[PDB]
Design a protein around this ligand. Structure first.
Ligand SMILES: COc1ccc(N2CCN(Cc3cc(=O)oc4c(O)c(O)ccc34)CC2)cc1
Ligand SMILES: COc1ccc(N2CCN(Cc3cc(=O)oc4c(O)c(O)ccc34)CC2)cc1
Lengths: 513, 513
């Protein structure tokens, strides 16, 4: 009696959404709203920040109204958590309260030249140079390099630089700013770790690097953890604070790939998960010891729950074309019309019958970092149908995530215990079979699959205390949200003929330049 | 001063047909009769000699019956030429006049063992040991290795040799034997050239080679030209003497591919034909004295008109997967369904935007002789589509020719003046234009696309004086029969780029064993 609810804003790359969870851990209201994907010249990608905040508020109030429709006693939400696309960086004015320009997105490639200035000059040829600090190579992806491009290239931004009006944030910062009404100006540690400006081990700003990299430290917010006060919601954008009825607090903020880690319950070391948006991200919890490169791979914050409380670390690898690849074979190549034709065409053959397909359309980017690798297929005979190609594309995804976990077993010094998985592609029986084989671990597939949203809610649910122990959290997720589970069923030298084929094919992929 | 008709028996691998041509090189009547493809053990292929003979006789009768039924001017046939599938070998008995067994076909692999034994035990391990006499490497194709194999496995054949009675013949010789009711036992120079028992420089049976391979020369027929009197028709095997009415001389005989060359009017040094069927066969006329190859190509007789008459020689290259690759795309891969769409989709993109597709399913048969080559695609992005892949296949078919033509130009010491085409894939104008642009010569396409049977008919009509010379034959064609014409039309820097991409792609094809 007296049912409690926490809210979460999943701000993504192509859309925004808000998801109300109960105390039993169920999404009970949801609403989605897209924003525009602006592409000036090839490789660029911008989002309108106002569009994002407007999206977030419409999600909010429409979701809240729907919960009332099905529970008329719902008076308020205890707290709101955030989670978001990371690296995407916003530029804004402190008293204009508003974007000086569109926000360049994580996978934009406008920063190409600025990356080479830095990796040559500041990095003395070594891209890794800053990596026992940031936990990251130098790339076009991370925040600081966007910040530069914006200080260099934008009339308004360079103008505001000097006048002391220039705030910079990741989307988590920018949401939490306008939501509170200009009141809050903070970031959580996981988001912070993406900026190329944080010290991974102290979880504090790196004044050597801000200075070395020519970004005025006063543009940055105060780092906090993922599970504490951040601001309050005081705005009426799309009737947002009126619909909340009480003043509700913001008590979770967390980067998206780490939000999926937390909400899949990967609290203990050697626990990992794999998300499928377009590509992939694989994240393993490594314990409290910050781990570092041997190959490439990323060192990042997993989650620090609470005021200076226990912090947890992780390694991160990407596959760049995963759900994309299945869609490419359909829309571009006409290999099959309907979605479940793919899964049944793959089953209609015993195996690849010789061939390998390396779905490296836009370079190769898990332990092997060849950006000249292109999409290649080798070993085809006249006895090769689309069924073999579809299966080979599936094998390839798992053969990459194999190489990734191998690298994780090295760098982390641990073994991979569990691997929970989630997305468009985790609803595919045959991949979670193959992958479970080639890696040789159980694989868990959650029936409450909204786990990235769940992550943030939990953070705010802990801070406000709808749950208090991670045992409580984990015990509800056992007594409620069903796992399906998938064992391995493939013999050591089936697996070694498949990797030997794989490593032989990888050699033939180098193409561009 | 009445209308005159030459007929052509065109005896092919899957089928036999008789075309009747008039004095304007118009095919004006045609029947076709298939024959049965017997295959005992995998990779064997074997035809029935008497069944092949009956088709030729039914084709004759029916075409003739249909012709007078619709040409009141048609009185008789002035002569008959024969064109045939080439290396295929028949053993029959002089007394019984009946085959001692079935006929092993050009692409049959039962000569594999013999082919290793002959390369090892007589060419020290060099397969080209006899190439300066025969024009040919040791391979499973050629007639002598089929003749030998029959002595070594078929007891009735060794039997016959002993008793004095045995004949071996290629199909031209066999047809011409039974068409004569056993009176003529002769073979033309072009067919003789594919036995591996003829000396190219003399065009006589090589006593050296017969001795070494241990085929007695009593089992071989008399070598004659392509155009002269071979015999008359004296059988009533499907009322063919009845249908024919008159005495009708057999005055033309020529191997199919050389029939094509001749029927495309390629009478000069540096003229070529490519037949775009399932695979490709290219034959250039190299001139009046042989040229030998250092690229794996075959030297061969092109044609020779008149007993003791000028003999023109040729180089020959093949490629293995042309129309087959189209078929594969369509029916193993579903990149389209209806034939017309292939060229409509290739046409729908400016080029291949970076990709190469080597359709090397059963290896590389052109002048780079890798059988570990397998089908590869390289260079795909998410902007790649079946349109591109398809165009890329056409490009590939075009790049192998270009490379084959190259070899021949080196070995022959001449430029290609002009390329005539035929075969189904000749009705794809996009391939044809990619092909002229690559080669920088116009490409000629005959509207009357019955060139293989026309070759046989010309030889027959020259010897009967229907036509009186090679300037006449070429004039009657130019006047009476239309010719499409396709001129080069692309930058020579796009040309270089494709060849460069082709070359890089080749270097990635290697997969088998
Ligand atoms: C010039 O040669 C190169 C040197 C370094 C790189 N990298 C830069 C991009 N970075 C991609 C990346 C890998 C990954 O494992 O996770 C990522 C990730 O999680 C992101 O959010 C963004 C980018 C990556 C890999 C190393 C590429 C080419
Ligand atoms: C690198 O060492 C070699 C590898 C293969 C060969 N071959 C040359 C003969 N070739 C057969 C062949 C080639 C061709 O270009 O056209 C042919 C052809 O037109 C036929 O009718 C039959 C056989 C061939 C297959 C094996 C020779 C040397």
């Amino acid at each position: 009696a007296t049912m409690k609810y926490v809210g979460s804003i999943d701000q993504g790359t192509t859309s925004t959404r808000f998801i109300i969870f109960d105390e039993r851990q169920r999404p009970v209201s949801v609403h989605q709203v897209p924003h525009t994907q602006h592409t000036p010249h090839p490789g660029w990608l911008e989002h309108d920040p106002m569009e994002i905040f407007r999206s977030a508020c419409k999600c909010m109030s429409v979701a809240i109204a729907k919960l009332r429709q099905k529970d008329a006693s719902f008076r308020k939400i205890e707290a709101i958590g955030i989670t978001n696309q990371r690296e995407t960086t916003v530029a804004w004015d402190r008293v204009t309260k508003e974007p000086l320009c569109y926000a360049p997105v994580w996978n934009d490639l406008r920063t190409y030249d600025i990356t080479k200035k830095v990796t040559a000059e500041l990095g003395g040829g070594d891209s890794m140079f800053a990596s026992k600090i940031t936990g990251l190579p130098v790339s076009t992806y991370f925040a600081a390099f966007k910040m530069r491009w914006m200080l260099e290239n934008v009339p308004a931004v360079a103008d505001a630089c000097r006048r002391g009006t220039l705030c910079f944030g990741t989307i988590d910062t920018w949401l939490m700013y306008k939501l509170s009404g200009g009141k809050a100006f903070v970031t959580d540690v996981t988001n912070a770790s993406r900026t190329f400006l944080m010290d991974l081990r102290t979880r504090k700003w790196s004044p050597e690097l801000c200075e070395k990299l020519k970004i005025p430290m006063e543009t940055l917010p105060e780092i906090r953890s993922n599970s504490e006060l951040f601001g309050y919601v005081e705005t009426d954008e799309c009737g947002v604070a009126a619909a909340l009825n009480e003043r509700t607090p913001i008590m979770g903020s967390i980067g998206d790939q780490q939000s999926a880690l937390f909400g899949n319950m990967c609290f203990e070391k050697g626990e990992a998960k794999n998300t499928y948006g377009t590509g992939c991200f694989l994240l393993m919890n490594v314990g409290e010891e910050a781990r570092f490169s041997k190959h490439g791979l990323l060192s990042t914050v997993g989650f620090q729950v609470g005021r200076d409380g226990p912090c947890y670390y992780a390694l991160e690898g990407a596959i760049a074309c995963a759900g994309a690849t299945v869609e490419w074979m359909r829309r571009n190549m006409n290999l099959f019309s309907h979605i479940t034709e793919c899964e049944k065409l793959a089953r209609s053959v015993p195996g690849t019958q010789g061939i390998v397909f390396v779905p490296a359309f836009s370079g190769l980017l898990a332990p092997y970092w060849d950006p000249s690798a292109r999409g290649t297929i080798v070993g085809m005979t006249l006895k090769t149908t689309r069924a073999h190609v579809i299966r080979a594309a599936l094998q390839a995804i798992a053969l990459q995530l194999n190489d990734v976990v191998g690298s994780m077993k090295r760098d982390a010094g641990l073994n991979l215990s569990s691997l929970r998985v989630d997305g468009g592609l985790s609803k595919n029986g045959l991949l979670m079979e193959i992958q479970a084989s080639l890696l040789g671990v159980d694989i868990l597939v959650p029936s409450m699959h909204e786990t990235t949203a769940l992550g943030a809610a939990l953070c705010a649910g802990l801070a406000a205390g709808v749950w208090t122990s991670l045992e409580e959290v984990k015990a509800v997720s056992r007594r409620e949200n069903s796992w399906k589970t998938v064992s391995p069923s493939g013999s050591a030298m089936e697996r070694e003929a498949m990797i030997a084929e794989w490593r032989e094919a990888l050699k033939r992929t180098k193409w561009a330049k």
